[PDB]
From a paper:
The PP2A holoenzyme is a heterotrimer, composed of a scaffolding subunit A (PPP2R1), a regulatory subunit B (PPP2R2-PPP2R5) and a catalytic subunit C (PPP2C). This novel interaction is mediated by a patch of basic residues that dynamically bind a highly conserved acidic surface present on all B56 isoforms and therefore constitutes a novel pan PP2A-B56 binding motif.
The MS analysis shows that a subset of the LxxIxE-containing B56 interactors are regulated specifically by the acidic patch for B56 binding in both isoforms. This includes the mitotic regulators KIF4A, RepoMan (CDCA2), Nance-Horan syndrome protein (NHS) and absent in melanoma 1 protein (AIM1), (ratio WT/2R > 9, p-value<0.05; Figure 1D,E, Figure 1—source data 1). Similarly statistically significant reduced affinities were observed when the basic patch motif of RepoMan, NHS and AIM1 were mutated (CDCA2/RepoMan 563RKKK566 to AAAA; NHS 1618RCR1620 to ACA; AIM1 716KRKKAR721 to AAAAAA). Namely, while the AIM1 LxxIxE motif was well-ordered, electron density corresponding to a single conformation of the basic patch bound to B56 was not observed. Finally, we show that the presence and contribution of the basic patch is important for a number of interaction partners to bind PP2A-B56 underscoring its relevance and generality.
Residue numbers in the entry:
A (entry chain B): 728 to 741
B (entry chain A): 33 to 53, 61 to 107, 126 to 376
Amino acid sequence: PHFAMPPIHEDHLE
Amino acid sequence: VPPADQEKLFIQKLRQCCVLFSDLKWKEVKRAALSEMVEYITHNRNVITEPIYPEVVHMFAVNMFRTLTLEAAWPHLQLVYEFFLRFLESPDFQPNIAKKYIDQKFVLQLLELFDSEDPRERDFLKTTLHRIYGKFLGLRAYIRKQINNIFYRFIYETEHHNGIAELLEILGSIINGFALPLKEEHKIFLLKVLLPLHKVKSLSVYHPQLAYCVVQFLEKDSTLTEPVVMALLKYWPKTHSPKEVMFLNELEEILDVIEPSEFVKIMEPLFRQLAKCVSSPHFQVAERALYYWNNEYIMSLISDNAAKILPIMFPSLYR
C-alpha cells in the first residue's frame, strides 16, 4: 500500500 | 572538576536549545546538543525521568510553535523533530506522566504546523501526530475532531491546507484499526467529510490518500458501499476531463473490495458511467476503463449478472 502507516487499533474508551 | 550527573546535563542541554537563534557558533552548539541528546535517549534505558518530560515538551514548543517553501534553519528543526520522535518512541516513555504537558493545546498547535509549505516538515509532523495518537488514548477523540474540522474548513470555506494528504495518511491507519461494528460517528465522517473531499479542485494532490481511506471503510463495513459509490458517481467529472483516471483508479480499488451483495445495488449506474468512459474522447480515460476487463474478480461479478451489464457495455450488440 506504499504510503500506509502502521495501523492504530481502536481499543480505547471515549 | 566533576561536571554533574547525566540527568542534569540532559536538562541543561534541553534548556540551551530553548534560546532561539558568533551566530554560527551558537547554532552549532544547539545542533551538537540535539544530536548528543538523540543518541542519549536512543541507546540508553531509564534516562527519561519525570523532570525530563516538561523540559522536552517545552523545548519542542519553543522551537516549533511559531508563526509560519523550504524552511530557513531546517537542519536545526529536523533534529528537534527527530529528538522528539525518539522521545515519544522510547521504551521509558510513560504517557501517564507526559499527558500533563502533551495536552489539547499542544495537539492544537501541532496541527497548525501541518499548513507548512515544507514537505519534509509535514512528513515529520505526520509521524509525530501518529505516535501521539497511538500512545495518548485520552487525546484520540480530540485529535479526530480537529482533523474533522480542518477538513470541513477545507471543503466549505477558504479551501487550502498544505497538509490534507498527510492528515489522510494518519486517518488511513486509524480507519484500518477501527473496531468490530463501526461507531456511528465514523460513518458520518465518511459520508459527510471524506466523500465531499472529491469535489475540491486540488483533489489530485491528496487523491491516493483519500482513496485509501474510502476503501478501508468499505473493507471494514460493506454496508456503506451504495452511498459511497453513488457519491463518487455524483462527484464524477461530468465534463470530459483527464481527472476521471483518478476516479477510475478509486472505483476499481473499491471493486476489488466490494461484496457481491452490494455490487448488484449499484452495478447499473456504475457501468453506465463506465461505458461513457470507454467512449471518452480522451485516450487515457478510455485506456484506464478498458483495463477493468483484466480484473478476474470484476469479470466474475459481471458474469453472475450478465443479463443487465452486457447491454450497457455493448449497446449495439443487444437488440
